[PDB]
RNA sequence: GCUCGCCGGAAGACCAAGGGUUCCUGUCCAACGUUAAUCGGGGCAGGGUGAGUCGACCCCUAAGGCGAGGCCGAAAGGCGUAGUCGAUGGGAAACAGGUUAAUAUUCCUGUACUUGGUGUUACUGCGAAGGGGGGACGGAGAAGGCUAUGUUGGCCGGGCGACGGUUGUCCCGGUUUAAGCGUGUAGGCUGGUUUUCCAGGCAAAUCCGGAAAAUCAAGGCUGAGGCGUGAUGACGAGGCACUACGGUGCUGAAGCAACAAAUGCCCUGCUUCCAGGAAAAGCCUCUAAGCAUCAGGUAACAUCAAAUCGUACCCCAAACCGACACAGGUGGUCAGGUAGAGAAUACCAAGGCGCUUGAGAGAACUCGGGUGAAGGAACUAGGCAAAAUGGUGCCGUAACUUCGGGAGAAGGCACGCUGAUAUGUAGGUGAGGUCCCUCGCGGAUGGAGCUGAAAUCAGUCGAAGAUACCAGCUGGCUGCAACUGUUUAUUAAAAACACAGCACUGUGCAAACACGAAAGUGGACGUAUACGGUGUGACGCCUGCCCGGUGCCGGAAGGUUAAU
RNA sequence: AGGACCGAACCGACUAAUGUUGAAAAAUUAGCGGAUGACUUGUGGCUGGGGGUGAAAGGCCAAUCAAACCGGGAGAUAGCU
């Protein structure tokens, strides 16, 4: 579990988005992007401490990258797992 | 399509 | 009791069934069915090693008690049932102890018949004991040809295996076929003869009816090409070749046969 | 009418994979000659 | 925006396969689009795929693959045991409403559910890789009982008609609600309980099975659907209100009955027939090696966990497969109204489209069609192609035959509408009332209401009433093949092939034969009533003669003869 | 009851027209045969080149089959153009 060092890793960096404004004023679920491996329970826990609230539940999703072309030559972006931490009455920033 | 037939004449 | 079916729509006309009303209808004794898969006549290589099988309706294979180890203890019939396997009816005989294993079906056998194996086994039709206890010229099925091996001979419907000899360790046997094979008297043997005697009587009748017993359509040789088979060709059917296996082996008149190690055993050639 | 190609990913890399070429010495043969041509696909997948 | 036109068993909708951001939005018009293009499945950028209970992963197994040792083979390698992998199979559990520009059984709202970990309490013999049970299965057929769904009536809301009528027996719309839980009906299957004994189920057994008794007659399992609950709600036609004119909040009436009814459900049933119809685990039980005040087992409550991966879009196509935005190909699922036997077909609902060049002119000729006076095959290799026949009910029907056929032979009549019989009949469905009940989802009695053909008589309109679409041309002689099928994918569907049957021949099982240098399999887990090969080709009448040549079998003295 | 009858889906491809640098490297249109079975089809395996398979056309084995395709011997040979 815990194992501080490899929670820091799991954050590492929010994806702000119109859709996700309205999923925070409304649903009050916090969106950002994650790890490209890590699990349920430590996006859950790193909530938990370095975001200092209570969490809710947590949902995950993948977005494939998608495939950019120019001429002859291709060249694929890369994939990138979003996270939907649900937060309960506790909610701050 | 070519086909391909005989010439027997 | 076989009843020629009546002349409704053609493949219908020159059918003849040949029912058995005494047959008890209903699921198969579930714990002795075992799994039966179709080889469609190829082996391990995947060729097919041999031609004119496959398809056909799936079967399921039933272990039959061939050795009839259990001596002493008294039997007594069950039911009859159908054998896709054979043309032989088998039947479910009960042991005194509760066992139950199927048996091949005797023409003197009904229900509630008490058959009983053994070396002191009274001589009726349906026991199996071995042959040295075997007064000669009586009808024998079922006999083995190792002791304790089963007994592969005499399995299909019909027949039967008289004992004309008994000189020696040896007693001789006289086939089906009509040839004469000596066999070791400690063999067991089954009393009597099967009952399924009307198994000839049935013709068939539709091009499709062999397909459901897995034969496949035979094509004649001559039909063929040089290539596939050695008949073939002369523009017009014609034939003017000697006759002959798609292999070259010569058909009609030709003796395969080539043991020498079983040649003690046979008193004389099938006539 | 059917075309001949009737694709299905499950039959491909069970036919054309890494797996079926490492099945047997003749196919790493095929692995070896791919690599010493030099190519960006020693194989195909995903 | 207002209309027209097409599909509507799809050209609508959904899933899988496969594709891989084509999805949504902003913006752009070089190239891509068989045209212009502000548009696009095109360029650029941003945004979008939310799962304990959908699926995969997972447990289990089929045909098979791989394969510790082993067997075999010049080497490579081949085969194969114990094993392992392998779904197109089986194996625990989420349904309705709402929301987004795009995702919803995933988020939210409401009500739920399954399997484990842990804790508390109660009772108690718990425990396999083993035994048994269960899982666990065919074709066809017959109905019956129901639901999805539809029609009508009632109820509620709205409407008095652009032109003669329309406050009435009028018109329009709505009348929708699941999983779960309780109840265990229409039915289907089986006689239950208890005691004793046993050569069986590799060990054991309280279980299965077998054998003796006793006792009792309903004991149990399975099971749609209905009725309650879930639901004081939710949804809801239509209004009140702000309004980026693209919508957002609030409020919101009735929400029943009767009939019809499936290809769906009860049904993995029932009946019946040979062609006799997978595999294992989960599951229910049995003990052994063992623990035996424990651990565990079962039950009520509480708590925790249910991870990883797929989730957008296309799905009979513009995106898959066809070099194309190609008249081709692509499996399953959803099955409205009227007419009709019907999933045929016509017109329509929901919904999706008018198919990415148009505007004209109204020549031949060509393609796709309509009609044609007189003749009716005179055309032509040939009735090729067109034309024609076409439905239901009934009358009636030959030669010939293997008595099933031929046969729908052929050839005719009747067919619309309206009234009466009967203001809607025969039937079907079935409420109230009455009575019987070991009293339930009961039964009898009772007949309202609803639904509803078919027939007779009379009257009536048209040239035509199966009026459209839909929808056999028929007879006679004869060749060939018995027939049903199969065949040269892409010029030959046939007299060719197959065929049941008949005959010959090989084969005694470690079979002949066949694959394979071998090993090992197939034949076959079959046993001469079986199997292989060859020929012939249903059935009926039959099937003559020739062994010189050729082939083969049988025979063993002699003639001849290899290696040695 | 049926390798039974008529007839959609489904499967098959008998006739004729159109098409023949087509919309399509074999289709469309109007008819046709089978349609409870020797049926059809989804999914996944098996038989590998003198071999496979074949209700037998020497057909089919990735638009090619009286011997597939790829690479190699190979710049094979060619008294021929």
Same mark, same amino acid.
């Given at each position: 579990?815990?194992?501080?060092?490899?929670?820091?890793?799991?954050?590492?960096?929010?994806?702000?988005?119109?859709?996700?404004?309205?999923?925070?004023?409304?649903?009050?679920?916090?969106?950002?992007?994650?790890?490209?491996?890590?699990?349920?329970?430590?996006?859950?826990?790193?909530?938990?401490?370095?975001?200092?609230?209570?969490?809710?539940?947590?949902?995950?999703?993948?977005?494939?990258?998608?495939?950019?072309?120019?001429?002859?030559?291709?060249?694929?972006?890369?994939?990138?797992?979003?996270?939907?931490?649900?937060?309960?009455?506790?909610?701050?920033? | 399509?070519?086909?391909?037939?005989?010439?027997?004449? | 009791?076989?009843?020629?079916?009546? %002349?409704?729509?053609?493949?219908?006309?020159?059918?003849?069934?040949?029912?058995?009303?005494?047959?008890?209808?209903?699921?198969?004794?579930? =714990?002795?069915?075992?799994?039966?898969?179709?080889?469609?006549?190829?082996?391990?290589?995947?060729?097919?090693?041999?031609?004119?099988?496959?398809?056909?309706?799936?079967?399921?294979?039933?272990?039959?008690?061939?050795?009839?180890?259990?001596?002493?203890?008294?039997?007594?019939?069950?039911?009859?049932?159908?054998? =896709?396997?054979?043309?032989?009816?088998?039947?479910?005989?009960?042991?005194?102890?509760?066992?139950?294993?199927?048996?091949?079906? =005797?023409?003197?056998?009904?229900?509630?018949?008490?058959?009983?194996?053994?070396?002191?086994?009274?001589?009726?039709?349906?026991?199996?004991?071995?042959?040295?206890?075997?007064?000669?010229?009586?009808?024998?099925?079922?006999?083995?040809?190792? =002791?304790?091996?089963?007994?592969?001979?005499?399995?299909?419907?019909?027949?039967?295996?008289?004992?004309?000899?008994?000189?020696?360790?040896?007693?001789?046997?006289?086939?089906?076929?009509?040839?004469?094979?000596?066999?070791?008297?400690?063999?067991?043997?089954?009393?009597?003869?099967?009952?399924?005697?009307?198994?000839?009587?049935?013709?068939?009748?539709?091009?499709?009816?062999?397909?459901?017993?897995?034969?496949?359509?035979?094509?004649?040789?001559?039909?063929?090409?040089?290539?596939?088979?050695?008949?073939?060709?002369?523009?017009?059917?014609?034939?003017?070749?000697?006759?002959?296996? %798609?292999?070259?082996?010569?058909?009609?008149?030709?003796?395969?046969?080539?043991?020498?190690?079983?040649?003690?055993?046979?008193?004389?050639?099938?006539? | 009418?059917?075309?001949?190609?009737?694709?299905?990913?499950?039959?491909?890399?069970?036919?054309?994979?890494?797996?079926?070429?490492?099945?047997?010495?003749?196919?790493?043969?095929?692995?070896?000659?791919?690599?010493?041509?030099?190519?960006?696909?020693?194989?195909?997948?995903?």
């Amino acid at each position: 579990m815990i194992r501080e060092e490899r929670l820091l890793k799991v954050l590492r960096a929010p994806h702000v988005s119109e859709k996700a404004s309205t999923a925070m004023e409304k649903s009050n679920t916090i969106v950002l992007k994650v790890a490209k491996d890590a699990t349920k329970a430590e996006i859950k826990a790193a909530v938990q401490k370095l975001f200092e609230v209570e969490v809710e539940v947590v949902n995950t999703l993948v977005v494939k990258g998608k495939v950019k072309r120019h001429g002859q030559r291709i060249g694929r972006r890369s994939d990138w797992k979003k996270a939907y931490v649900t937060l309960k009455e506790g909610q701050n920033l | 399509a070519v086909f391909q037939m005989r010439n027997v004449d | 009791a076989v009843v020629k079916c009546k %002349p409704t729509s053609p493949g219908r006309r020159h059918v003849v069934k040949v029912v058995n009303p005494e047959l008890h209808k209903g699921k198969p004794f579930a =714990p002795l069915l075992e799994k039966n898969s179709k080889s469609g006549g190829r082996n391990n290589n995947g060729r097919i090693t041999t031609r004119h099988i496959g398809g056909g309706h799936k079967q399921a294979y039933r272990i039959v008690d061939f050795k009839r180890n259990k001596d002493g203890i008294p039997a007594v019939v069950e039911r009859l049932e159908y054998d =896709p396997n054979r043309s032989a009816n088998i039947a479910l005989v009960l042991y005194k102890d509760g066992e139950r294993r199927y048996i091949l079906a =005797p023409k003197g056998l009904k229900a509630g018949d008490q058959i009983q194996s053994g070396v002191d086994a009274a001589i009726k039709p349906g026991n199996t004991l071995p042959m040295r206890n075997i007064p000669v010229g009586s009808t024998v099925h079922n006999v083995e040809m190792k =002791p304790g091996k089963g007994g592969q001979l005499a399995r299909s419907a019909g027949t039967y295996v008289q004992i004309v000899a008994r000189d020696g360790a040896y007693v001789t046997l006289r086939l089906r076929s009509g040839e004469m094979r000596k066999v070791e008297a400690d063999c067991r043997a089954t009393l009597g003869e099967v009952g399924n005697a009307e198994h000839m009587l049935r013709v068939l009748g539709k091009a499709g009816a062999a397909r459901w017993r897995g034969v496949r359509p035979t094509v004649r040789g001559t039909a063929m090409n040089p290539v596939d088979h050695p008949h073939g060709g002369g523009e017009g059917r014609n034939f003017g070749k000697h006759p002959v296996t %798609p292999w070259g082996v010569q058909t009609k008149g030709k003796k395969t046969r080539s043991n020498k190690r079983t040649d003690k055993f046979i008193v004389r050639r099938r006539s | 009418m059917k075309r001949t190609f009737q694709p299905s990913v499950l039959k491909r890399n069970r036919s054309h994979g890494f797996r079926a070429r490492m099945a047997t010495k003749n196919g790493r043969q095929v692995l070896a000659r791919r690599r010493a041509k030099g190519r960006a696909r020693l194989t195909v997948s995903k």
